[PDB]
């Protein structure tokens, strides 16, 4: 959203569930945003650096999330198995 001359004219841009590209509308509570993590090449938790992702309320209600992430950090680049795009 913007003017004639490149002036972002808004309150903000809404944040949008990360697997579901709906919206997160202010006063959700249900509302999470994850901060997993990465290892460094060693049993050491990497600090000040992490992943992210972002759950609606939407799906907390429906069982969903557990299987929605178990798509995504396997789908990203950390996890191996559990999950299948071919059930």
């Amino acid at each position: 959203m913007e003017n004639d001359k490149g002036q972002l004219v808004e309150l903000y841009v809404p944040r949008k569930c990360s697997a579901t590209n709906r919206i997160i509308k202010a006063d959700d509570h249900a509302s999470v945003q994850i901060n997993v993590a990465k290892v460094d090449e060693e049993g050491r938790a990497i600090p000040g650096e992490y992943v992210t992702y972002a759950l609606s309320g939407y799906v907390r209600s429906r069982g969903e999330s557990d299987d929605s992430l178990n798509r995504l950090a396997q789908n990203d680049g950390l996890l191996k198995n559990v999950w299948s795009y071919s059930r």
């Binding site: 049993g43 907390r60 069982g63 999330s65 557990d66 178990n70 198995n81 559990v82």
Partner: protein, 206 residues
């Protein structure tokens, strides 16, 4: 992850033939388990006898997911148990919760023995009905230890055995762990035995 000997060695038809874990049940085969070797013409379901080393030891890397095993528990409320799950809590990680489970303990900020896990487990999914539900909630993976008998919706993997009396409830977790530990921990790698008995493991007093 195909390795080497986690593979059966010189004794994995000798020691559960005196304890019964291939066995199923009476007139009962629950649509919800590959987890029944046929099914005989005289009585009874000869649980498939090769695929529990398939979803009772998913069940050991999934954790390996603990950085800190006392979260790695054992879920229960039976009699023959309170002497294997209490006890899965001792020799490694976990609050025992047999007897009091502690309802909530996973719903709801208001109780006593406080929970906020990421893969709990569960003896009898007939006695342990609230890792299937206290999970169909919000974000708490579960794992039922799925006889011919375990509503399977939402305890996403299989863990089959036999519980019609006797031993193998407790004496079966034992295997979840040993082989969870031989990924990560402190024991030792074909064999140099294993210093208890499956005949410590049974009752404490009737």
């Amino acid at each position: 992850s195909l390795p080497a000997t986690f593979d059966l060695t010189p004794e994995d038809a000798q020691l559960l033939l005196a304890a019964n874990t291939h066995l199923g049940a009476r007139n009962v085969q629950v649509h919800q388990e590959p987890y029944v070797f046929n099914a005989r013409p005289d009585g009874v379901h000869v649980i498939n006898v090769g695929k529990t080393w398939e979803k009772l030891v998913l069940a050991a890397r999934i954790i390996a997911a603990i950085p800190n095993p006392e979260d790695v528990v054992a879920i229960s409320s039976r009699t023959f148990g309170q002497r294997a799950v209490l006890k899965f809590a001792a020799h490694t990680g976990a609050t025992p919760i047999a007897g009091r489970f502690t309802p909530g303990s996973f719903t709801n900020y208001i109780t006593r023995s406080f929970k906020e896990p990421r893969l709990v487990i569960v003896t009898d999914p007939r006695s342990d009905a609230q890792a299937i539900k206290e999970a169909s909630y919000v974000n708490i993976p579960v794992i039922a230890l799925t006889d011919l008998d375990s509503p399977s919706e939402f305890v996403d993997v299989a863990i089959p055995c036999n519980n019609r009396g006797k031993h193998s409830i407790g004496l079966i977790w034992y295997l979840l762990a040993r082989e969870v530990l031989r990924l990560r921990g402190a024991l030792v790698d074909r064999t140099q035995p294993w210093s208890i008995m499956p005949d410590l493991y049974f009752y404490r007093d009737p």
